[PDB]
Coordinates of C-alpha atoms and ligand atoms in Angstrom, one line a residue:
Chain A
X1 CA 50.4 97.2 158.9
X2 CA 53.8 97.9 160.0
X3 CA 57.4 97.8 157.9
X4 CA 60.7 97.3 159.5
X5 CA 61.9 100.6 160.3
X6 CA 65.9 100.3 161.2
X7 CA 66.0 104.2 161.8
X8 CA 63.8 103.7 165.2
X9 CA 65.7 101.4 167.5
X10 CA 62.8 98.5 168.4
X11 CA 65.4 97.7 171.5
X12 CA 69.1 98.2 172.2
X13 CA 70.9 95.2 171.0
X14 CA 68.8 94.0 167.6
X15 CA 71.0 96.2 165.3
X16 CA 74.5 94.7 167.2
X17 CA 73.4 91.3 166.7
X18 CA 72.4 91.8 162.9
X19 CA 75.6 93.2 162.3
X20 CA 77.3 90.5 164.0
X21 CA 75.7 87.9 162.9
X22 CA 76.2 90.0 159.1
X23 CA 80.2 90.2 160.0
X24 CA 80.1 86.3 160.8
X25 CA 78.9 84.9 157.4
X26 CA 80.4 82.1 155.9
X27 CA 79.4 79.4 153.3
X28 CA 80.4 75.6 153.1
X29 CA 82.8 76.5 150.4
X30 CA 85.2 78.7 152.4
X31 CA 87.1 75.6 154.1
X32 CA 88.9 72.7 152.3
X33 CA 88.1 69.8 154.2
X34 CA 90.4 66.8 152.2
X35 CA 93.7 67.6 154.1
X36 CA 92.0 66.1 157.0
X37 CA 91.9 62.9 155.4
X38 CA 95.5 62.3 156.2
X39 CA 94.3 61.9 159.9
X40 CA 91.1 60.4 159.4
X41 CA 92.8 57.5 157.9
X42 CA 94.6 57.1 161.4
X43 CA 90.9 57.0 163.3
X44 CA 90.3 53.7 164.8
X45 CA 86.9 52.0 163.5
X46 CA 85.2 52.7 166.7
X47 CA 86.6 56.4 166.3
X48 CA 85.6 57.0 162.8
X49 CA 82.0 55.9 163.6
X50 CA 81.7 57.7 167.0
X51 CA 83.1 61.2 164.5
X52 CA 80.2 59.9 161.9
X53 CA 77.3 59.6 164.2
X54 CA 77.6 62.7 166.2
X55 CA 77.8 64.4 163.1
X56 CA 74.6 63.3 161.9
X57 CA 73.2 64.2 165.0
X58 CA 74.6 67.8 165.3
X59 CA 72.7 67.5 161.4
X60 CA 69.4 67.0 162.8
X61 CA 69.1 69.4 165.3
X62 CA 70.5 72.3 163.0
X63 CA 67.9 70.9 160.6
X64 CA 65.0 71.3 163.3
X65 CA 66.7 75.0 164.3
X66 CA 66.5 76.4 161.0
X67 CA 63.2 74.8 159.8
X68 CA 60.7 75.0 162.8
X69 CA 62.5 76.8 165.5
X70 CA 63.8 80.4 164.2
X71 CA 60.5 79.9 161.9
X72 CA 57.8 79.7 164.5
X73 CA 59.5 81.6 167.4
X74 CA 60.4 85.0 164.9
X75 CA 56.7 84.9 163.4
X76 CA 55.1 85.3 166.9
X77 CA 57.8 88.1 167.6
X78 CA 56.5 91.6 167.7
X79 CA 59.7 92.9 167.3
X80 CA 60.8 93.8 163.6
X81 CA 64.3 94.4 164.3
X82 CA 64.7 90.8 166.5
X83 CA 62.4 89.6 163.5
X84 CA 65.4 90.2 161.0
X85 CA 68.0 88.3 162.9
X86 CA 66.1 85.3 163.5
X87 CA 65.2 85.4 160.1
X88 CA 69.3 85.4 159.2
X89 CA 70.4 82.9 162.4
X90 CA 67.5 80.3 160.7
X91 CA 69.3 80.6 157.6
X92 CA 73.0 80.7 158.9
X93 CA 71.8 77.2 160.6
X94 CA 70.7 75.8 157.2
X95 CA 74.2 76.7 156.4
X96 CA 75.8 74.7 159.5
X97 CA 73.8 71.5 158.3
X98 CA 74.5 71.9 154.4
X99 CA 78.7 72.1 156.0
X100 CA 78.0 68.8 157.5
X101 CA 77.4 67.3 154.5
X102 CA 80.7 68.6 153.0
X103 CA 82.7 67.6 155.9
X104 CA 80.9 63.7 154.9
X105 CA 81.1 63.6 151.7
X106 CA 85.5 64.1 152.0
X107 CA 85.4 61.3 154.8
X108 CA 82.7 58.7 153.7
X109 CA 81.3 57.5 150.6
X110 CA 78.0 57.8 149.5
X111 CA 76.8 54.5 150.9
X112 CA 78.3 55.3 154.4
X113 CA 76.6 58.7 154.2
X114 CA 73.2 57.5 153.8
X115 CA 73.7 55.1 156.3
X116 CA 74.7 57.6 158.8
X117 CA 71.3 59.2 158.0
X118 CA 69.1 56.0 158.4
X119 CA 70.5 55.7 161.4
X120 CA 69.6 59.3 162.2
X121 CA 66.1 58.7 161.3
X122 CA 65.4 55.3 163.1
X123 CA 67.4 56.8 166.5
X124 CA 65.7 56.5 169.5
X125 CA 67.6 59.0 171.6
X126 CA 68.1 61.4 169.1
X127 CA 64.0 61.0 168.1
X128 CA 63.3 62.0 171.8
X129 CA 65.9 64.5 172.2
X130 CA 64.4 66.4 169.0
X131 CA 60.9 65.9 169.6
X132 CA 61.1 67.4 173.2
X133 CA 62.3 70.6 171.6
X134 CA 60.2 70.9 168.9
X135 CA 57.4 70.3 170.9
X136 CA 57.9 73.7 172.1
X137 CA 57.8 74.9 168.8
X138 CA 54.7 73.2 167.2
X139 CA 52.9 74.8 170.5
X140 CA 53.4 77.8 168.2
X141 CA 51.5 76.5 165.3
X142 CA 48.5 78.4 165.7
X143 CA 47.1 81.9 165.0
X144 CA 48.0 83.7 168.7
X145 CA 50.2 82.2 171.2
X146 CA 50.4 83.5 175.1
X147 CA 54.0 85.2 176.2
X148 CA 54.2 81.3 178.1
X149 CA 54.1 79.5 175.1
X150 CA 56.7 82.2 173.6
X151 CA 58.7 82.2 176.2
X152 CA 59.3 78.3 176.3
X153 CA 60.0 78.2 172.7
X154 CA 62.8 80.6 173.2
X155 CA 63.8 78.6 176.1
X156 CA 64.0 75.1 174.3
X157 CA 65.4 77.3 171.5
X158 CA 68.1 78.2 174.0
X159 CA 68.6 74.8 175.5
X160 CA 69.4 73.7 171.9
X161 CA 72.1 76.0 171.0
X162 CA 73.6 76.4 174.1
X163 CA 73.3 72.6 175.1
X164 CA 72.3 70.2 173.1
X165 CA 75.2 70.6 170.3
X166 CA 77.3 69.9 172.6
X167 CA 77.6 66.1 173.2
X168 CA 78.3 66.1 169.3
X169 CA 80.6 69.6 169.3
X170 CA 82.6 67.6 171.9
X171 CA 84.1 65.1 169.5
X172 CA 85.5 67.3 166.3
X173 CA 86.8 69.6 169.3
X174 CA 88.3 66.8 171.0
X175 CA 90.2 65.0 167.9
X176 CA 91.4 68.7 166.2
X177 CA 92.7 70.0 169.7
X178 CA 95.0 66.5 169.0
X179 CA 95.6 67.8 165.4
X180 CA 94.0 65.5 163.9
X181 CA 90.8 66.6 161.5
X182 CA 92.2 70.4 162.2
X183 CA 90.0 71.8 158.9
X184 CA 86.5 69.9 159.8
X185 CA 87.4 71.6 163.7
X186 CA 87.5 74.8 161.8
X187 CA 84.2 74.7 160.4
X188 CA 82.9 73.1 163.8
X189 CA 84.5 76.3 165.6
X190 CA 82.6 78.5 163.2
X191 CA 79.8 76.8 163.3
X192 CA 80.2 77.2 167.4
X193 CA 80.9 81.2 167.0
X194 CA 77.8 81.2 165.2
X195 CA 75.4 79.3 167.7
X196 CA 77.0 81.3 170.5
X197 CA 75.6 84.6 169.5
X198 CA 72.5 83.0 168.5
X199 CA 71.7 81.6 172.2
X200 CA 72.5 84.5 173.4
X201 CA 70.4 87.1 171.8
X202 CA 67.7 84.5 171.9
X203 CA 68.5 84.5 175.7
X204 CA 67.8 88.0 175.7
X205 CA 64.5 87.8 174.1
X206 CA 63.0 85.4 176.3
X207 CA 64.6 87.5 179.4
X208 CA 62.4 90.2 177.7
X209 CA 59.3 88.2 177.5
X210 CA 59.9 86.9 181.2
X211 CA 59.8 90.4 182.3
X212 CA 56.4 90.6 180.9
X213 CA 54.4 87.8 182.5
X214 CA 52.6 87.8 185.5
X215 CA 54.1 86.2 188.9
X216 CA 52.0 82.7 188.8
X217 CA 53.4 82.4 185.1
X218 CA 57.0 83.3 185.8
X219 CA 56.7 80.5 188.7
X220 CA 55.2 77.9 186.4
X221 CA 57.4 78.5 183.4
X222 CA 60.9 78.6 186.2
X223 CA 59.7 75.1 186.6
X224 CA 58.9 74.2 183.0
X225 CA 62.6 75.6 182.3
X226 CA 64.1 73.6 184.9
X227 CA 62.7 70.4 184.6
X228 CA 63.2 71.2 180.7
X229 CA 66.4 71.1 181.9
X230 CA 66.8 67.9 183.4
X231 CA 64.8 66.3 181.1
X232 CA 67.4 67.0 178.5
X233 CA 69.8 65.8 180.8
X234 CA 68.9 62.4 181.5
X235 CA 68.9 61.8 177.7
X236 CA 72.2 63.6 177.0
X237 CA 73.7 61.5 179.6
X238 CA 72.1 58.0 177.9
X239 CA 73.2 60.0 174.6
X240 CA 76.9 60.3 176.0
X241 CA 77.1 56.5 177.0
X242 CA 75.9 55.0 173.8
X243 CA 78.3 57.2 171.5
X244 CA 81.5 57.8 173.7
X245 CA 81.6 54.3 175.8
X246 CA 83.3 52.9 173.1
X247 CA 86.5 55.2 172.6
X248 CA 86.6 56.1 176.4
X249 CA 85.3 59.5 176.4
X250 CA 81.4 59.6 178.6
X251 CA 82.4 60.7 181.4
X252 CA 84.5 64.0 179.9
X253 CA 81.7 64.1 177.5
X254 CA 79.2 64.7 180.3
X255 CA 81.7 67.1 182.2
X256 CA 81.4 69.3 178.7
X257 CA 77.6 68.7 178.7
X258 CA 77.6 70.3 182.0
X259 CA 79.4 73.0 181.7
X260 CA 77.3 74.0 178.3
X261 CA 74.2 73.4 180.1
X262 CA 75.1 76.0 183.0
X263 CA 76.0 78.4 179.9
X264 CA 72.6 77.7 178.3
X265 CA 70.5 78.7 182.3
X266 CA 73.1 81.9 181.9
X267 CA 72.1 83.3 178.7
X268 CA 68.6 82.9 180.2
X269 CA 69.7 85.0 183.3
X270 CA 69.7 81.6 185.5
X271 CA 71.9 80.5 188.0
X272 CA 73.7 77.3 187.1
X273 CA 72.4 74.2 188.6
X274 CA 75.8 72.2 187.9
X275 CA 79.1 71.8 189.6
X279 CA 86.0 72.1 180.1
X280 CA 88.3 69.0 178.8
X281 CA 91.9 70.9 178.0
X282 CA 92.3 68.4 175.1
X283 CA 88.8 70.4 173.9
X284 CA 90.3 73.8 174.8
X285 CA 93.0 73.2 172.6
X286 CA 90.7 72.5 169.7
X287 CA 89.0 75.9 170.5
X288 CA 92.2 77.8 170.6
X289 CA 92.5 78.8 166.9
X290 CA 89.3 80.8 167.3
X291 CA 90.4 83.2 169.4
X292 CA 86.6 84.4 170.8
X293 CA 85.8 80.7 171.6
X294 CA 88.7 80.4 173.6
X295 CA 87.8 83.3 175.6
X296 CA 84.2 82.5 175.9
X297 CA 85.0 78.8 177.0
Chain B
X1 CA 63.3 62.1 162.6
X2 CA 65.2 63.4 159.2
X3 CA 68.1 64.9 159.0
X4 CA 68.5 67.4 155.8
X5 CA 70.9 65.0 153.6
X6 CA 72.5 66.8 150.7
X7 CA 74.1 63.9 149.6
X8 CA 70.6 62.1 148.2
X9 CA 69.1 64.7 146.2
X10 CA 65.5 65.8 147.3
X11 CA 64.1 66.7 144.2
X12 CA 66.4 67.8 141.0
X13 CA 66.2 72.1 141.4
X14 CA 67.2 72.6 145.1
X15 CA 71.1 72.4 145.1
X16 CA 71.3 74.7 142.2
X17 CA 69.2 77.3 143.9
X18 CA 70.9 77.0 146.8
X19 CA 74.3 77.5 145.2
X20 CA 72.9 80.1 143.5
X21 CA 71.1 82.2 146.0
X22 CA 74.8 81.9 148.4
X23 CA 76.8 82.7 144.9
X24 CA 74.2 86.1 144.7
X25 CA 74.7 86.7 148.7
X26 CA 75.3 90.4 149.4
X27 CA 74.3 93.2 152.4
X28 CA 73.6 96.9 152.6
X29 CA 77.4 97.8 153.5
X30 CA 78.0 97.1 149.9
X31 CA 77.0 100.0 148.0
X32 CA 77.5 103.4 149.6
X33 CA 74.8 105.9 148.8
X34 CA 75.9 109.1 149.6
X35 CA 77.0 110.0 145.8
X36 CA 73.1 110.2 145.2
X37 CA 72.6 113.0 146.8
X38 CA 74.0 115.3 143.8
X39 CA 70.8 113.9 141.6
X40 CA 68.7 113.3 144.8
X41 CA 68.5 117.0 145.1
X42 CA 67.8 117.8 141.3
X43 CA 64.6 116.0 141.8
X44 CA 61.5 118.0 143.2
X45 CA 59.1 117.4 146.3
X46 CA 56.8 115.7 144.1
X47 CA 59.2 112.6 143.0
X48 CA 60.9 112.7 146.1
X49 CA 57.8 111.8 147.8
X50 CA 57.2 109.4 145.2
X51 CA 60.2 107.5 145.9
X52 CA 60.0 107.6 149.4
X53 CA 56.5 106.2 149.8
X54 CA 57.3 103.6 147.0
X55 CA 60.5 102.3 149.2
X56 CA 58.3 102.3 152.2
X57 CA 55.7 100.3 150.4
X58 CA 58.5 97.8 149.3
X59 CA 59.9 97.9 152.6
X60 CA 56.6 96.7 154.0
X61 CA 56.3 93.7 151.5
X62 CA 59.8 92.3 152.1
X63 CA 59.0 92.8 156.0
X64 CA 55.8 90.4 155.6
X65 CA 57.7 88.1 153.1
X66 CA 60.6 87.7 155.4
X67 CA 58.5 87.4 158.4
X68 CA 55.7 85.2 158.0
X69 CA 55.7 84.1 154.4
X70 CA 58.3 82.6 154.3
X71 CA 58.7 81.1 157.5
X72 CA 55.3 80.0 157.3
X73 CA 55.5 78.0 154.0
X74 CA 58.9 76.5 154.6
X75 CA 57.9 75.3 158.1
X76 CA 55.2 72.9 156.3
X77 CA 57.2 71.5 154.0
X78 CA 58.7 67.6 154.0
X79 CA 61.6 68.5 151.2
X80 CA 64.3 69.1 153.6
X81 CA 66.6 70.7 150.6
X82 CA 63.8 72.8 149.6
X83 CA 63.1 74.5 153.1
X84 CA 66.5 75.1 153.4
X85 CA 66.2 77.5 150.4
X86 CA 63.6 78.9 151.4
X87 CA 64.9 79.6 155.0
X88 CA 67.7 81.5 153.1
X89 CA 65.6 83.5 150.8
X90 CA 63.3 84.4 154.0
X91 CA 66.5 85.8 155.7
X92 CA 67.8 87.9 151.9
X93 CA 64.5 89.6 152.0
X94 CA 65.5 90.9 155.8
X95 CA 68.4 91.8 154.0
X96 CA 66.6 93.6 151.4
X97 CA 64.4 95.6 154.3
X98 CA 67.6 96.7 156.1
X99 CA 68.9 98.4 152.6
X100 CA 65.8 100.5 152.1
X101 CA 66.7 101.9 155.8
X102 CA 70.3 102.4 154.3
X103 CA 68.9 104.1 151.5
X104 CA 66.6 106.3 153.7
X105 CA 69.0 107.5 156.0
X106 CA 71.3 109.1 153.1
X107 CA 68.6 110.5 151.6
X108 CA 66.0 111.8 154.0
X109 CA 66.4 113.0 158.0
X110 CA 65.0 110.9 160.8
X111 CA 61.6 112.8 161.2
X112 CA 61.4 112.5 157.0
X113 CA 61.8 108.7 157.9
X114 CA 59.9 108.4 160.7
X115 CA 57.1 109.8 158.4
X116 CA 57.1 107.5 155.8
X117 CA 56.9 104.2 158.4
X118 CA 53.7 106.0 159.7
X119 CA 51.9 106.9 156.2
X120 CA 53.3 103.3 155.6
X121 CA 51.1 101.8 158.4
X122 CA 47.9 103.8 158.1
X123 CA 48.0 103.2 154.1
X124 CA 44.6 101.4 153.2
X125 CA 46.1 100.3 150.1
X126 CA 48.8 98.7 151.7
X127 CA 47.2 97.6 154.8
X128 CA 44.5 95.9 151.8
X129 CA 46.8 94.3 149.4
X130 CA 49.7 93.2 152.3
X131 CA 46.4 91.9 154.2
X132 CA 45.5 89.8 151.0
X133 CA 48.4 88.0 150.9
X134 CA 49.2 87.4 154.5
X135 CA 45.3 85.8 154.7
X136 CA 47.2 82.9 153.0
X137 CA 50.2 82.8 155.2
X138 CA 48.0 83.1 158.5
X139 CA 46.2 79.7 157.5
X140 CA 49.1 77.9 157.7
X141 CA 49.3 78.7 161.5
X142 CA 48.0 75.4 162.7
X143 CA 49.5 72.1 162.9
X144 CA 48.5 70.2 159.9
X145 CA 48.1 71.8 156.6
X146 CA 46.1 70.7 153.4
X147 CA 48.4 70.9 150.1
X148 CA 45.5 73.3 149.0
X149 CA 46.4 75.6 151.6
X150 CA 49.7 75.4 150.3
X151 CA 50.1 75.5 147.4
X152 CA 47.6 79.2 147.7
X153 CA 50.5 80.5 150.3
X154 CA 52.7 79.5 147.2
X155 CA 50.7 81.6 145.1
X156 CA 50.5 84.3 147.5
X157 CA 54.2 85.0 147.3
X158 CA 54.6 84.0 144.1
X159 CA 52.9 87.0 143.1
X160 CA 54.0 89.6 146.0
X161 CA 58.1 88.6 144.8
X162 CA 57.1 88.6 141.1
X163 CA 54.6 91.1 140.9
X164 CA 53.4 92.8 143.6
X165 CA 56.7 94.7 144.1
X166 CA 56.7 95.6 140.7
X167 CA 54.6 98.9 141.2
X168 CA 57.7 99.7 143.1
X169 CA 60.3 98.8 141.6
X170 CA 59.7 101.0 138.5
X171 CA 60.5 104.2 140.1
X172 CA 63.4 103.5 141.2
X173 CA 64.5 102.0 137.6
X174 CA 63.1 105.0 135.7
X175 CA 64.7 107.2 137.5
X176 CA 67.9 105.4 137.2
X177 CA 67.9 104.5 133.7
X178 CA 68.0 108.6 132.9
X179 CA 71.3 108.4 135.1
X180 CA 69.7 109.8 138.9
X181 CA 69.8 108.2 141.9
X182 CA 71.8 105.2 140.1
X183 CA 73.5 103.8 143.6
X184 CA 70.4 103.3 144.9
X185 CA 69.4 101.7 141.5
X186 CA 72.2 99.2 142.2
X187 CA 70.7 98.2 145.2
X188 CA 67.5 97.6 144.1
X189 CA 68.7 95.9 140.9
X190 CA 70.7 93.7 143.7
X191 CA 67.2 92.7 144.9
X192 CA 64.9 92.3 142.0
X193 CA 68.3 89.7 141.0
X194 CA 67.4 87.8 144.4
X195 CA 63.6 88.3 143.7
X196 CA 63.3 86.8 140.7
X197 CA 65.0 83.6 141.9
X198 CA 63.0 83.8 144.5
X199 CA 59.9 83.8 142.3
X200 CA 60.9 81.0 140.0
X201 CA 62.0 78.9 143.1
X202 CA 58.4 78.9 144.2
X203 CA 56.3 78.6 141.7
X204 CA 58.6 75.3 140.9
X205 CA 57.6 74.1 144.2
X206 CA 54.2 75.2 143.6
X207 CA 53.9 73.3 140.2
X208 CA 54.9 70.4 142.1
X209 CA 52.4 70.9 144.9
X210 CA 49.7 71.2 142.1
X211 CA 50.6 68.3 140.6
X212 CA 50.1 66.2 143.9
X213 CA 46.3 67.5 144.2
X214 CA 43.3 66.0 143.5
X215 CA 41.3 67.4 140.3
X216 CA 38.7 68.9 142.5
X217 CA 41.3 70.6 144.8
X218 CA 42.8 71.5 141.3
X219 CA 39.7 73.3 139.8
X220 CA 39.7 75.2 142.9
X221 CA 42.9 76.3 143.3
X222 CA 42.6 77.3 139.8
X223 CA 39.8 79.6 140.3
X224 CA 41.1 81.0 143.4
X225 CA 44.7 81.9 142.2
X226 CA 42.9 84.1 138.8
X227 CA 40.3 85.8 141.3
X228 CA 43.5 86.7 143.6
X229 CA 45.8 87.5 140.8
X230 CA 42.6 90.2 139.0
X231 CA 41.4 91.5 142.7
X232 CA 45.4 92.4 143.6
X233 CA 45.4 93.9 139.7
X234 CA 42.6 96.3 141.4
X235 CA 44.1 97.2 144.3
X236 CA 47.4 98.0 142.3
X237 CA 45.3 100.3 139.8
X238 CA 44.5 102.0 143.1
X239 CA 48.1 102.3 144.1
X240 CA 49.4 103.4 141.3
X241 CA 47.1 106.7 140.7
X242 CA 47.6 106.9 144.1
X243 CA 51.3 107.6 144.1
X244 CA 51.9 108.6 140.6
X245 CA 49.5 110.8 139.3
X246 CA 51.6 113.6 140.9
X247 CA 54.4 113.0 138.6
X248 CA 52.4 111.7 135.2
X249 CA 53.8 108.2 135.5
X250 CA 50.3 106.2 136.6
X251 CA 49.7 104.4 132.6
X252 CA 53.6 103.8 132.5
X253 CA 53.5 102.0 136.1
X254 CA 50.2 100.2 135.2
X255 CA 52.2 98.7 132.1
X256 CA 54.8 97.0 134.1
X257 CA 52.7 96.1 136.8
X258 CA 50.7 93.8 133.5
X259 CA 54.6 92.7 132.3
X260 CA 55.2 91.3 135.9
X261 CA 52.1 89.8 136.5
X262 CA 52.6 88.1 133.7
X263 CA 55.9 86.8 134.4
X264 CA 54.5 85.7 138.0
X265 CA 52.0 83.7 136.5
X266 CA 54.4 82.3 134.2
X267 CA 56.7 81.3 137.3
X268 CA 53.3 79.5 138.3
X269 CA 53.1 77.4 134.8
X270 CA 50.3 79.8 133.8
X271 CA 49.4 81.1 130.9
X272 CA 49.9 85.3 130.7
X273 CA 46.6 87.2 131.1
X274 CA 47.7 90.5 130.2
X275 CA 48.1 92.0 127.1
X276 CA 51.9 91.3 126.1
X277 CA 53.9 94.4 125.6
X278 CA 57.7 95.4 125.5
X279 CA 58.9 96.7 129.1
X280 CA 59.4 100.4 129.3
X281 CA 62.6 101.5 127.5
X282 CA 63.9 104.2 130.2
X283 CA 63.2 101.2 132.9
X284 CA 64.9 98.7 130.3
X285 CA 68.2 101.1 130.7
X286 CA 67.5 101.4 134.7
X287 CA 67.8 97.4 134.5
X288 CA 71.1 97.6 132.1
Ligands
LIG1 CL1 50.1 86.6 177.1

């Protein structure tokens, strides 16, 4: 039975992103978040509860990240080395959720919170959204799994980081590229550092396992992955509309979804199958690598 | 679908591990190595084989631990706080594996390392007693899971981090408690820290899972976990004259391999089964 041996490179990029990922770490107690409360104060109602609910949305699909996706796609994994950095990206997304909740508790009070999570919990779209994913990752639950069923994981596992966040990511970028909730828009641009590098490499895994499958199943999972795609789309967009029609904001929402989504098909080696708000680009300025990569 | 809500506590133990575990957070780049070398070289073929093949042996357990146990247990879990721990713990015990390497490469060359992973993967010992405990892991690969199954993959690493590594983890102490190889020593004190959190954690959640099973499924589960904890006591036996005899340490080893079985079962709720008996005193000073 075989250890992980870091002295004999398992591929050519595991050891960068462990030491990335390594350099990147951060806890929920490095940022102060009650200096934002001077702004939050200013948020209309329809404001505050548009911040609130994506929030608790960007909360469940870190919780389904950490807990069944890096889980089930890294124990199928072959690869030691790509083993160990799933392993830490599972656990840095436990982190991004537990930040949520400290970001919360400085804005809301207790009652507000846990009504932000029953409304989590009883969400149509956002029950949809997350099962579609995580059906790709239950596929996994049994003893061997085909490259297909590996390779659509990592795909969903892709579409998540790359794209789903960021309907939710949209909103604290948005308000802190105003000024306004500046130290919860530093913990989202960490928390955006973090799932950058994580769709990436992921991307590079399943461009690894696509390599490997025969011609009729890289045709049948093209299509799986494309009309994956769309699938996603047509709830973000209902997603979009129910959040942001109240505060003005669906169709720059959608243009952000976009965008996100053609960076998601990239990291995969796709083409992009769409045609960023400045207001957003300023909230991404103080991280200088976000910047660039947006 | 639930979102992981740290504002409504899960259960009353999972905040304080999770502070605790990011409060004890740490990686490889943290303690340089290279001032071993000096006793390193003092020691002869004989123990520095020993230490090797232990480190690989480690290396091996935290590679399983990390990689399927506990992805494996957390993924069936319903405490949302809880699998957040353990999703953290899973990814320390990666961390733990990549400071082995870290300690290899100052001490040994590349073909000297390369060795080791080899004898580490065509070990019967190894393959036997890593095979034992990932049986348990395994079953949880399918999409429902009894809380028998389980709580028995709770057991399984219950005693891998609280006792299985212990065979291990002696030589490393010995050594250091007489003053050699003591950076190294600081690393692995720096894991057996995290491991034994990690060994309390779970068998708190198992103790809860035990509690939540019928008395038949309890009379089982019971039997089971004493049959696994006295066939992995045989295959330790085993290990130990295996790797020690060279260097007269096999009835020293085999003393705190009963001392941490022990504790594993008390981190369980269990009663010991082993003859109780101070630990070692030159270990003792490599723990200091
Ligand atoms: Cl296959």
């Amino acid at each position: 039975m075989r250890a992980v041996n870091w002295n004999k490179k398992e591929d050519d990029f595991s050891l960068m992103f462990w030491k990335q990922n390594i350099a990147q770490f951060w806890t929920e107690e490095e940022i102060a978040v009650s200096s934002d409360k001077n702004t939050w104060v200013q948020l209309s109602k329809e404001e505050q509860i548009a911040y609130k609910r994506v929030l608790g949305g960007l909360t469940l699909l870190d919780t389904k990240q950490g807990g069944e996706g890096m889980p089930l796609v890294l124990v199928h994994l072959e690869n030691l080395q790509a083993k160990s950095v799933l392993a830490f990206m599972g656990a840095m997304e436990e982190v991004h959720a537990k930040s949520y909740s400290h970001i919360f508790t400085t804005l809301a009070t207790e009652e507000e919170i846990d009504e932000i999570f029953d409304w989590v919990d009883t969400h149509p779209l956002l029950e949809k959204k997350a099962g579609i994913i995580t059906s790709y990752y239950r596929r996994l639950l049994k003893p061997e799994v085909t490259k297909k069923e590996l390779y659509m994981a990592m795909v969903a596992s892709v579409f998540l980081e790359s794209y789903l966040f960021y309907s939710g990511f949209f909103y604290p970028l948005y308000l802190a590229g105003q000024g306004k909730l500046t130290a919860s828009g530093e913990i989202i641009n960490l928390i955006i550092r973090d799932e950058s590098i994580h769709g990436v490499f992921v991307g590079i895994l399943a461009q690894q396992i696509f390599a490997e499958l025969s011609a009729e199943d890289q045709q049948e999972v093209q299509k799986e992955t494309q009309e994956l795609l769309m699938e996603l789309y047509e709830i973000e967009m209902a997603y979009t509309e129910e959040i942001y029609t109240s505060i003005g904001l669906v169709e720059d929402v959608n243009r952000f979804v976009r965008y996100n989504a053609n960076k998601g098909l990239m990291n995969l080696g796709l083409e992009p199958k769409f045609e960023i708000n400045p207001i957003v680009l300023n909230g991404l300025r103080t991280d200088t690598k976000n910047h660039d990569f947006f």
